[PDB]
């Protein structure tokens, strides 16, 4: 007998409210949902995890003094092109990237890895445009 | 202001405070003001 591998399944849609949630402790469960490791028929070689819509990513919460001390970082390739950006300003200017970055580094590297990052759809503010899918609201 | 690694009182009117993660020493005689560093 050989281990069941599934006929490719249709995904599930999922809405999460990021308000008041700690950054890393939402990022972990979101990354699990993306990987489909909440599924009894999980198959490591295919993308079967759900789609995850995140709302109120601006009101994501954070412990310690991170708001001023967490530094997201970028290298442009030129001499001097290391840019430091504190979490404070990241939230004021691109508040969806906070959750998107955190969630990223907890997703495998590689094609399937960077293919799942596109099945996460983080939004600031309380609404999202993915009404057509009618995502089951998940509590985490 | 004196910056050093040994901030001590110098006179009896000297005061040892710790503001913003650093030990200062403030006093009415300005030559006594000290930050640690």
């Amino acid at each position: 007998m050989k281990t069941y591998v599934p006929k490719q399944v249709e995904p599930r849609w999922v809405l999460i409210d990021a308000e008041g949630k700690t950054l890393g402790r939402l990022a972990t469960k979101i990354a699990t949902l993306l990987r489909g490791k909440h599924r009894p028929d999980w198959t490591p070689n295919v993308a079967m995890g759900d789609f995850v819509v995140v709302v109120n990513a601006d009101k994501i919460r954070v412990t310690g003094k991170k708001l001023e001390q967490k530094i997201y970082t970028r290298y442009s390739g030129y001499p001097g092109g290391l840019k430091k950006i504190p979490l404070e300003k990241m939230l004021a200017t691109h508040p969806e990237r906070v959750l998107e970055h955190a969630v990223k580094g907890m997703l495998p590297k590689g094609p399937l890895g960077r293919r799942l990052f596109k099945r996460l759809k983080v939004y600031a503010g309380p609404d999202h445009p993915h009404q057509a899918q009618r995502p089951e609201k998940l509590e985490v | 202001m004196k910056v050093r690694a040994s901030v001590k009182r110098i006179c009896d009117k000297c005061k040892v405070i710790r503001r913003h993660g650093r030990v200062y020493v403030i006093c009415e005689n300005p030559k006594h003001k000290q930050r640690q560093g």
């Binding site: 442009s76 390739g77 030129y78 001499p79 | -």
Partner: protein
């Protein structure tokens, strides 16, 4: 933020108060507006100006259809001016009076494949004292094993010119509205007969 399209025509010096002022002359007007960018429609705010009338033969259907939504005759060049919403539906040289200061944007004279001396003002090598076939050469371009590579944006020979250049805060010396001319003190990018953009300056 007023702006107008025009061609650069040539340079001269007029005289003004016992002082000779170098000028370059720009055939500015007139520029019919053919589309308006609004925050509802397009997110930002800008006016699409046209310039130089064009032989209706040489204008395809889609382009010709664009003009018809606005009732503008086929024109040669279309260009936007950002954060400009003029009252009329024709921008002319009248929006500039003398004393004002302008920014002029134009495609510079292309110098083609430029060596490291003409392009980046390098010094090259000696012309005697032993110099060996490196007279117009750049020299070192790196270090050694560390980093063992060349920095991005390392200034080298290559193409130079025929790029956009905005020269700023030029005094508007005169305006000849009958001729759609526009005097401008100093130098303006581009060759004679090249299309420039004249805008209200951003200085103080």
């Amino acid at each position: 933020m007023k702006g107008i399209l025009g061609v650069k025509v040539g340079m001269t010096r007029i005289f003004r108060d016992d002082r000779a002022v170098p000028v370059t002359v720009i055939l500015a007007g007139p520029c019919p507006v053919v589309q308006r960018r609004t925050p509802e429609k397009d997110g930002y705010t800008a006016v699409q100006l046209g310039f130089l009338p064009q032989n209706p033969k040489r204008v395809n259907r889609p382009l010709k259809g664009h003009f018809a939504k606005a009732g503008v005759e086929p024109v040669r060049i279309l260009r936007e001016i950002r954060d400009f919403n003029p009252e009329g539906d024709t921008v002319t040289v009248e929006i500039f009076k003398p004393g004002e200061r302008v920014d002029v944007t134009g495609t510079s004279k292309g110098r083609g494949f430029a060596g490291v001396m003409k392009r980046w003002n390098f010094a090259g090598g000696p012309d005697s004292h032993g110099a060996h076939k490196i007279h117009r050469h750049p020299g070192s371009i790196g270090n050694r094993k560390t980093p063992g590579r060349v920095y991005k944006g390392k200034k080298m020979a290559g193409h130079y010119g025929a790029e956009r250049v905005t020269v700023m805060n030029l005094e508007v010396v005169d305006v000849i509205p009958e001729e759609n001319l526009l005097l401008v003190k100093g130098a303006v990018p581009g060759p004679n007969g090249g299309l420039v953009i004249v805008r209200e300056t951003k200085k103080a």
